[PDB]
Structure 1
Amino acid sequence: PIVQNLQGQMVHQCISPRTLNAWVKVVEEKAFSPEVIPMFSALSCGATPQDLNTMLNTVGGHQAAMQMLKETINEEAAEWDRLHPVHIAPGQMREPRGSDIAGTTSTLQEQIGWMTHNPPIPVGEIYKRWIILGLNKIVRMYSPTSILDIRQGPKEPFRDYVDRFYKTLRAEQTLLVQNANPDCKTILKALGPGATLEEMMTACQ
């Protein structure tokens, strides 16, 4: 990543073993559960494109997903090249192409050069946006169940139903009342409109 030192210049630092290990584990344990994406974003804070490629490449399974991500990345790179065409002056900074931003045709030195320039071309933040676009599509695709099939069981506590319901909504990116069981539905209808979630859960406890 690029960090500020103790004396206030922006410098390159090796990706840490703890960071590498945390990512691989979270993917092993959680696959593409929606909470994996904010974890990715936080572990890749200050990342160069090389660091972002390292994190993606260290994943060993889920190679269907990692291929779909490559496709999304290539579409975003091609749209970048559409908006930002490029033509080098000895010793001068060249302009990045899509593939430079994705770290396939750029060196670490060029990446540091762009990201620390005054003003900076934040190639790591741009690439991370493309990656997260790609990851969100994967989360949606690997969502097991439609929100239409989340209905409260006759013996299911209302709290457990609401947990399943919002978990599903998150992955898919008055239905709550419609899908409640007969007993809670009756209570909820009687609360009248514009009830908060806290009030609905309280009433159905």
Structure 2
Amino acid sequence: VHQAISPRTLNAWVKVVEEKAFSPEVIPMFSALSEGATPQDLNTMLNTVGGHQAAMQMLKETINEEAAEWDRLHPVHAGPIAPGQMREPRGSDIAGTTSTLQEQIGWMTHNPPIPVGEIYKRWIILGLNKIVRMYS
């Protein structure tokens, strides 16, 4: 079932960001609010944050570094993709830039799973830590 992140959860997120100047609490708050999120939902959460450009850029940079690093440890296998099976996720696909919601669930539902939502979420959390470090 595709159940998008609720508007209730987004304004709570916004409220947190609004109310903190990126204080350490925004981290457990983010993980508590992104439970089972697809990359698509994670970006929605992140793009609702406006007006903190310098911090957002630091966060973007961390994701981008981590997506590249994922690519380099996960060499693609060559060949054509057969009906039904899925492509191998790239860094940009993990971050939802190059991938659809269908594909994201595809990867997360798979057995064995490739938990793109949890992977991307680990990278966000690393960005967020750099942010709270700078701003305290």
With the shorter chain as reference, the TM-score category is over 0.9
Q: Distance in 2 between matches of 1:90 and 1:70?
A: 34
Corresponding residue for residue 48 of structure 2: 58
1:21-73, Cα deviation, whole Å (9 max, x unpaired): 10001100012100111001100001000000000100011111111111111
Q: Distance in 1 between matches of 2:113 and 2:76?
A: 17
Shift of residue 91, structure 1, vs aligned partner:
2.5
Shift of residue 89, structure 1, vs aligned partner:
1.6
1:158-199, Cα deviation, whole Å (9 max, x unpaired): xxxxxxxxxxxxxxxxxxxxxxxxxxxxxxxxxxxxxxxxxx
Shift of residue 86, structure 1, vs aligned partner:
1.4
Q: TM-score, normalised by structure 1?
A: 0.62
Shift of residue 15, structure 1, vs aligned partner:
1.2
Calculate percent identity across the aligned residue pairs.
98
Q: Distance in 2 between matches of 1:114 and 1:128?
A: 15
Q: Distance in 2 between matches of 1:76 and 1:70?
A: 10
Query: Residue 12 of structure 1 aligns to a residue in which SS?
Result: coil
Residues 114, 122 of structure 1: 8 Å contact kept: yes
Structure 1 unaligned segments of length 5 or more: list them. 1-10, 142-204
Shift of residue 19, structure 1, vs aligned partner:
0.2
Larger RCO (CA under 8 A, 6+ residues apart): 2
1:99-151, Cα deviation, whole Å (9 max, x unpaired): 0000000000000000001111100000000000011011001xxxxxxxxxx
Residues 85, 97 of structure 1: 8 Å contact kept: no
Corresponding residue for residue 47 of structure 1: 37
Residues 101, 126 of structure 1: 8 Å contact kept: yes
Q: TM-score, normalised by structure 2?
A: 0.93
- Higher Rg: 1
1:36 to 7, 17, 26: 26
Residues 20, 55 of structure 1: 8 Å contact kept: yes
Query: Residue 99 of structure 1 aligns to a residue in which SS?
Result: helix
Q: How many residues align?
A: 132
